Design a protein around this nucleic acid. Structure first.
Ligand SMILES: [Mg+2]
Lengths: 98, 104, 55, 130, 67
RNA sequence: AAGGGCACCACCAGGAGUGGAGCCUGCGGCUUAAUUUGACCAACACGGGAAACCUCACCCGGCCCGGACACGGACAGGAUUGACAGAUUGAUAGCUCUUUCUCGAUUCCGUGGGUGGUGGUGCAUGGCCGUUCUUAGUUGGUGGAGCGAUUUGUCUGGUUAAUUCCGAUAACGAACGAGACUCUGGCAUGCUAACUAGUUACGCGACCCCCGAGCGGUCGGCGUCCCCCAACUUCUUAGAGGGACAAGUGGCGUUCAGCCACCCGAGAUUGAGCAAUAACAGGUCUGUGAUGCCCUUAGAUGUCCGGGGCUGCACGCGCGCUACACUGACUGGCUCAGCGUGUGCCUACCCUACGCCGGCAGGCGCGGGUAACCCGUUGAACCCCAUUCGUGAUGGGGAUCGGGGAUUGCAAUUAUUCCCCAUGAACGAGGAAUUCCCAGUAAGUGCGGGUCAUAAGCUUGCGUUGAUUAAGUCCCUGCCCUUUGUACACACCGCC
């Protein structure tokens, strides 16, 4: 996939802000409904997610027409080292105020 | 203050709809609210008629699905303000409430 | 292809604009009451939605 | 008002939401003893109760799994933040849930038990449950 | 299949060496042997092309010909 | 083969028809680059399949990777990506060619390996569905009989829509199916209620009569929840209930199960839904991110775009629509419905009142309605009442075909649809055959919904007018039970 660094970084930082990713299966959506300010489409979002799933950093669930990727711990470490985040900040799903 | 409140209760089963009408009317009567009679809008029948088969082979047998929507509504009257008097709804799942002031 | 002609064909109407919300099928859709769901998918999820067979 | 959808479309949308949530929960929680979903919808906030057998397995490490499921449902259905809460309830007398016995028999068959023995065990367990 | 046309050629890039298309003089005099794209999105880092009849901006796609 | 019973997917007696004409549409064949394909009672207006594009699976061409990941090469002295111009192209696809710019580690190449497919296989399968079958049938336990496959129970008989029941009984006690059940229709001047439903009454009006009424006649005119400023629920809406049970009477019957008739009653058989054991090589892999195997996977069977095709016609068949006319057609007047839809997550596209313009299709402004609030008191058709026509292929029929005007859409040619003026073809009740049907039924007749940007000759429902014949039979077509015969068991489309 030929997505740029900024798009990849935004896609990863959404997963780290919260350890889930919901995406409609539509490669022709001009913008993802969330993070539409970065102007990256659902095609790039879902391809980045499939790369993460094939590398084992996320669990993929598919209902009717949507993906519901769940971040794993193997993905927690990978996103930590990729985004250079300190070993103190965790997603809200991983920890809620505690 | 003086306020007018109409409560529209819409559901799919007459048992739950009648229960949620009756308890509201009973509570308002106990608090001596003037309750306009429970009025029943005509029931809506959402009817869908499809082919039973998924492939178009057979004797052309049709499936008839119905969905019954029942609508009741109440009007509350008091010289005092009514929202502070009754704030809960005391409903059960399957019914939907709609509170409306007479201005709208 | 590139951005100019990949999805250039208008899809504002017709059967190509509409697909089932479950199986992504373009045939036998039910647009009554905004279901937007396939003929067989409705038979599958009728009781789940609240559609029953009275008669 | 005009922004609000009609009663018929609203009820059909509610049924569609129930069916979609049921399918998603069935696919995600099938191995976790999922049995069914009930939703009591209130305008202030909505609660989703998951009827399961292995509710301790449904609730992940310190509730991580239920947190993930709540966030996923929130994003997919566009609920306002904090307005949807998911709880899990253990089914009483799980042998009487025909759904749960289906995944139990599926578990036995995937494990490799003979089909006659597995079916007879499930049948005996259902009758023992009463 | 036996399609009448032969297999379509796919373009391969020229794989050019170092760019170095700006020269200094007398032990260093800042000077450009090319053209600068004047748009605010091309900026100063990019340089316009040197075709036989026009100059083309790499980002801004602006073309300046002489007539 | 016999005995008994049953059914308008059988007949009788009839009705409407179909088969004959034209046309719409679906099959076969022919033609074609392609005319994608499944299916042959239980396929052929079926795949909710009314295809201009999409759909689309077919044909002629052209792009893109939307080939994860691992490993090995290559690489910040550059892996690689886009691109204005000209040539090229159907194309304003930098698709490719000349030209250099440009992004920078995201990729590129190779090997494994993904992934996708309306690709094959429904004779590998799941689910669903049809059919045997909506007939009344089916099965354990214990006991009895048999060496055993099995049998009894599950029956001589009467009765029933029904192995429904009464009874006889080596069976007894049960279970499913039938029934019961759910929805709908018919009645409640009884209850609960109603400005998002009305009716009466009263007050303002408007018009007629006025001799003279006057509590006169009409008003879908306005008011009396615009809260002190009327009542009521008959009509409408919808809940709780009640109501019908073969209950009462007469007869038949073992006087049992029940049957016939009659009274009172709204109702003495309202329609549906659901629906057993076992099975079919019945249909669907073209519903599915249901699916095993196989095929393909970069010059793709993935996906996208352009164009064509799915409509193509010496012909045969099926479902239908319009008719063949005077019980009719045309013109005008009058007059009555019920189902039910209505502004969109994605998704762009609603129902429409009123005013104006036009002859029409339509167009232009203003609203109202997310709805017992607006369309809408749904001023529907047929029917009814007047006019013209006059038994002729005629004012029946409107196929074919020319010209013009609008609307939808990105696009109307192979005519999308609608309007106007011209053309008035077959067709004068249809052979052999053959379908459906017993009461608000057949049929005539329109109106909704689905499909729908544009749309119904289709289908699913609704109302309106509304009958003839029959209350039987096993003759034909079949079905159920018993006995019977069998060399059949792939079960008579058998076997030989
Ligand atoms: Mg004439």
């Amino acid at each position: 996939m030929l997505m740029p660094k900024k798009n990849r970084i935004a896609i990863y930082e959404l997963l780290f802000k919260e350890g889930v990713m919901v995406a409609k299966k539509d490669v022709h959506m001009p913008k993802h409904p969330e993070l539409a300010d970065k102007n990256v489409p659902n095609l790039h979002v879902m391809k980045a997610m499939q790369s993460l799933k094939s590398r084992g950093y996320v669990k993929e669930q598919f209902a009717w027409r949507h993906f519901y990727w769940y971040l794993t711990n193997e993905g927690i470490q990978y996103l930590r080292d990729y985004l250079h985040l300190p070993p103190e900040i965790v997603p809200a799903t991983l920890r809620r105020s505690r | 203050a003086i306020h007018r409140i109409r409560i529209t209760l819409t559901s799919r089963n007459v048992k739950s709809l009648e229960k949620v009408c009756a308890d509201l009317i009973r509570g308002a009567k106990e608090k001596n609210l003037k309750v306009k009679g429970p009025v029943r809008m005509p029931t809506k029948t959402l009817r869908i008629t499809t082919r039973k088969t998924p492939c178009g082979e057979g004797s052309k047998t049709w499936d008839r699905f119905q969905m019954r929507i029942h609508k009741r509504l109440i009007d509350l009257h008091s010289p005092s303000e009514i929202v502070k008097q009754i704030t809960s709804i005391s409903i059960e799942p399957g019914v939907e409430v709609e509170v409306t002031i007479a201005d709208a | 292809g590139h951005q100019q002609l990949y999805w250039s064909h208008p899809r504002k109407f017709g059967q190509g604009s509409r697909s089932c919300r479950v199986c992504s099928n373009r045939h036998g859709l039910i647009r009554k009451y905004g279901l937007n769901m396939c003929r067989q998918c409705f038979r599958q999820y009728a009781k789940d939605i609240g559609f029953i067979k009275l008669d | 008002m005009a922004v609000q959808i009609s009663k018929k479309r609203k009820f059909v949308a509610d049924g569609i939401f129930k069916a979609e949530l049921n399918e998603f929960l069935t696919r995600e929680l099938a191995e976790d003893g999922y049995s069914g979903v009930e939703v009591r919808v209130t305008p202030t906030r909505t609660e989703i109760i998951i009827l399961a057998t292995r509710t301790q397995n449904v609730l992940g490490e310190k509730g991580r799994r239920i947190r993930e499921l709540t966030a996923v449902v929130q994003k997919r259905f566009g609920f306002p933040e904090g307005s949807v809460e998911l709880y899990a309830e253990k089914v009483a007398t799980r042998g009487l849930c025909a759904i749960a016995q289906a995944e139990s028999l599926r578990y036995k068959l995937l494990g490799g038990l003979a089909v006659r023995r597995a079916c007879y065990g499930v049948l005996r367990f259902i009758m023992e449950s009463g | 299949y036996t399609t009448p046309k032969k297999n379509k050629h796919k373009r391969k890039k020229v794989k050019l060496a170092v760019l170095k298309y700006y020269k200094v003089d007398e032990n260093g005099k800042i000077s450009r042997l090319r053209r600068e794209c004047p748009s605010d999105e091309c900026g100063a880092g990019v340089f316009m092309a040197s075709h036989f009849d026009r100059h083309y901006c790499g980002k801004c796609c602006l073309t300046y010909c002489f007539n």
